[PDB]
Write a protein that binds this ligand. Structure first.
Ligand code: HEM
Ligand code: HEM
Ligand SMILES: CC(C)(C)OC(=O)N[C@H](CS[C@H](Cc1ccccc1)C(=O)NCCCc1cccnc1)Cc1cccc2ccccc12
Ligand SMILES: CC(C)(C)OC(=O)N[C@H](CS[C@H](Cc1ccccc1)C(=O)NCCCc1cccnc1)Cc1cccc2ccccc12
Lengths: 457, 445
């Protein structure tokens, strides 16, 4: 199968036997995708072992894969295992089981169900400040993901279930301590390597009850959801799963935990990591931070409480969040498995090929963005948003399988940014790694953690 | 009793004695609420005779009335009589009777019972195309609500009872269309609303607003006819045989009149916006190639079709207003509302507010796109109401209408007919309808 892209006349790096091109990942997915886009142009192919991966960068073709031909051709992502009972998780589900679950979990993030969560998040916004004030009253660096990680946990545990689990901290909370080591795709680990480079050992590992999420983490979270599921008010992610489990049919008990673990993860890890990138950029661009602070005070004078409506009114904040996501799309890539032979936009694609959208590369392509390395929130002004293509800039994906928690993620991060910049300013402190080095490993994180100085206003 | 809104400091137009403000309805309910929305902003109160009506536009206040404090304070709509045996209908009943019926008829539109009706509807979707093709191969302008109203009668008499009858001169469509005619210049509907203190005179006199021998053509037909009918006989074996017919009168009128009128409102906008009709015709051929028959699932995938239906129902909300009767003194969202006031949600005026809609008069299905769907408050756009007393057939109507719209744009395109009223003039009468009947030229593909 290593002669596939030569057959189709599609350029790409020459693959080694067995390994394919995975050796080229020594700088990470992101540097590999940039170089290949520069070397080969609009379309190229490579192999993750024996798995052909076709990378597409054309906006029309991307819309076909992500939106037009989703339900019929590009329905699922690259198979990820061994996962055990977590195969029922929405992000991992396939075909009919995914359609069932997506529809069932959509009503969790309506503008009505979101509006109902601002007062709940309004509790832990003030808590995030009080923990910040302590580290501010005394000259000392502040690791942001710890304090952002704590905030995220409280926000996902109470809006989806109704359970306050972090009493002002309580910094050694078992939820965060177990959830951070939930999945760490270390490519140096022979495990995630051999899974990718020889993706036929999953069935063995599955019958051996081996899982990519450690057992004590899955157990602790599994015990807790059974401890949370009693419910004997407001309809929440726990209620939407329980009212329909009580009523084809239906939602299982090991399935109801699976969706909770997915939500519990993304709510904690994705939110806190993007919040760190933002604050790093504001601290390294004081003009942008002052301008954002100037906007927050105009919309919310006297440190007014942020509301659902006032969050959406702030134009510069939305630009700051978007430009950061442009530079740091935490998904790095978007993938879809081609389930049958298709010829999209005049290009034949055979069954079984994974179609990959190099999001990180597209977000930094000079042919789409001026000075793509520079942090310029003005790209996303309404004056300039004409020249921004929704299929080049896809930080939450696109189409029927985009980020289901997008609106929740943006509001939770915006509510956090408002109540923080309302009370503090952020300066570098030399131990701040400048410029920021990105983790040359699997997921999108920095090398050294983000540490900043916090001053009170 | 006319100095109420003056006491509470709530703005409003001055009431004439006995009449109140009902002389401003000469332009219809819709134009009155919009005039009031501009002059008296946010909240105002007027009078329907001796009946004070508080019009609220704040979406949080709308949510309190429609959802939060529904079961408690705002359970019942405005009193409507004389009704007779029709007092037992779900839309007219109150409190306890409403609760037992709202739960009883809710299983009619579960995701299961609603998927059972797809092969029942898919038969009449070919008689509609075969009847339009006789008037399309000939260059004859088609009156849309006629051929539509026929399709709406079959679907409701076969998804609720299981009897195939309609489709031309059908006795059901004939008696159903004249079931109620709220002409506001008829001295009947005017007075009993303005001077309602004579309603119980007509109630003890066995008088009713619905025609006697129109209620009889439908009272004996149900005695003649798992679906909607079956779901009620199983609980009957305290549902009486009089309250049973009351519900069939509701489902048949709604399933016929409400479906046909909106579909005509849809077809009018698609003809006036060819770039919208063509863009919708290209989406139906992609999810359903070779004119593939539409199923339950292929309907929910079509996004533009939903954004067209939602933009029409924004423009033409056939209910115009939502109403709840405040049953005790309350102070909701920082405002005293006494007992007996009718709280009114001006659905038509809200669906065209420039504060919530840009270029509202213009038809743009792009307001409901997933990118712009975020900007839509679910208490400003409430074409089916909201809360525990919303439209029970909303999920049924949203599917049934979309089932009709798909089987038509696969075979025919629609152009104006010169005699088509452009722009469409709304009926300055009572209900929401066009003045002249909608007519369009039908060209086959
Ligand atoms: C800054 C924060 C976040 C970003 C940038 C982000 C990004 C993404 C991306 C790129 C995808 C895949 C889209 C595609 O394949 O086209 C996705 C999917 C998903 N996201 Fe997020 N996400 C964030 C936070 C969250 C949160 C807070 C939740 C809470 C539940 C969440 C839940 C999910 C789920 C369940 C999926 C799977 C979608 C499916 O398969 O149906 N994400 N997200
Ligand atoms: C486009 C079509 C339709 C629209 C826009 C519509 C609109 C509405 C509205 C606004 C309400 C009142 C909500 C409130 O007061 O808060 C309602 C209630 C109701 N609708 Fe519909 N309707 C439609 C079609 C139908 C259909 C097809 C049926 C079939 C049976 C139906 C049966 C009912 C009934 C029985 C009620 C009263 C329920 C109650 O009072 O508890 N409607 N509808
Ligand atoms: C096969 C490869 C790897 C090539 O690809 C994929 O199939 N891996 C993902 C499916 S395994 C992952 C299971 C998990 C659970 C708990 C903690 C860690 C991992 C998941 O389900 N994670 C999505 C749910 C949470 C989330 C994360 C980020 C943003 N929002 C929500 C598919 C996938 C889904 C959604 C977003 C993704 C972003 C980046 C990479 C993959 C993504
Ligand atoms: C007191 C006023 C008038 C100010 O107000 C109300 O109380 N009148 C309605 C209750 S009398 C009406 C009885 C009827 C039956 C057969 C044919 C004509 C009339 C009804 O039951 N009609 C609802 C049932 C069908 C339907 C219609 C439209 C949309 N969906 C379903 C209350 C009411 C209920 C539901 C929807 C309404 C829409 C517009 C106006 C009133 C509505």
């Amino acid at each position: 199968s290593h002669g596939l892209f030569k057959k189709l006349g599609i350029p790409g790096p020459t693959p080694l036997p067995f390994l394919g091109n995975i050796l080229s990942y020594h700088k990470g997915f992101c540097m590999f995708d940039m170089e290949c886009h520069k070397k080969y142009g609009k379309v190229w192919g490579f192999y993750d072992g024996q798995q052909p991966v076709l990378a597409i960068t054309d906006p029309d073709m991307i819309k076909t894969v992500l939106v037009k031909e989703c339900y019929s051709v590009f329905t699922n992502r690259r198979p990820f295992g061994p996962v055990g009972f977590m195969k029922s998780a929405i992000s991992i589900a396939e075909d009919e089981e995914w359609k069932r679950l997506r529809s069932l979990l959509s009503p969790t993030f309506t503008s009505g169900k979101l509006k109902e969560m601002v007062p709940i998040i309004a509790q832990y916004g003030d808590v995030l400040v009080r923990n910040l004030r302590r580290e501010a009253e005394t000259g000392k660096p502040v690791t942001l993901k710890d304090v952002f990680g704590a905030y995220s946990m409280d926000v996902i545990t109470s809006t989806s279930f109704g359970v306050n689990i972090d009493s002002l901290n309580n910094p050694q909370d078992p939820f965060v301590e177990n959830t951070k080591k939930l999945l760490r795709f270390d490519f140096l680990d022979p495990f995630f390597l051999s899974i990718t480079v020889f993706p036929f050992l999953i069935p063995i590992l599955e019958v051996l009850n081996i899982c990519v999420f450690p057992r004590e983490v899955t157990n602790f979270l599994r015990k807790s959801v059974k401890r949370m599921k009693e419910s004997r008010h407001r309809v929440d992610f726990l209620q939407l799963m329980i009212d329909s489990q009580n009523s084809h049919k239906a939602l299982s008990d090991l399935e109801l935990v699976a969706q909770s673990i997915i939500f519990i993860f993304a709510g904690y890890e994705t939110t806190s990591s993007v919040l760190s990138f933002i604050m790093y950029e504001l601290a390294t661009h004081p003009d942008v931070q002052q301008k954002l602070q100037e906007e927050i005070d105009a919309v919310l004078p006297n440190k007014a409480p942020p509301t659902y409506d006032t969050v959406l009114q702030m134009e510069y904040l939305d630009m700051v969040v978007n430009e950061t996501l442009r530079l740091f799309p935490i998904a790095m890539r978007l993938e879809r498995v081609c389930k049958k032979d298709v010829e999209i936009n005049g290009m034949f694609i055979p069954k079984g090929v994974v179609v990959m959208i190099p999001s990180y590369a597209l977000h930094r392509d000079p042919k789409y963005w001026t000075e793509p390395e520079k942090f310029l929130p003005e790209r996303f002004s309404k004056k300039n948003k004409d020249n921004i293509d929704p299929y080049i800039y896809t930080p939450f994906g696109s189409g029927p399988r985009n980020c289901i928690g997008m609106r929740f993620a943006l509001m939770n991060m915006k509510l956090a940014l408002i109540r923080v910049l309302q009370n503090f300013s952020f300066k570098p402190c030399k131990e701040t790694q400048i410029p920021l080095k990105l983790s040359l490993g699997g997921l999108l994180q920095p090398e050294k953690p983000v540490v900043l100085k916090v001053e009170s206003r």
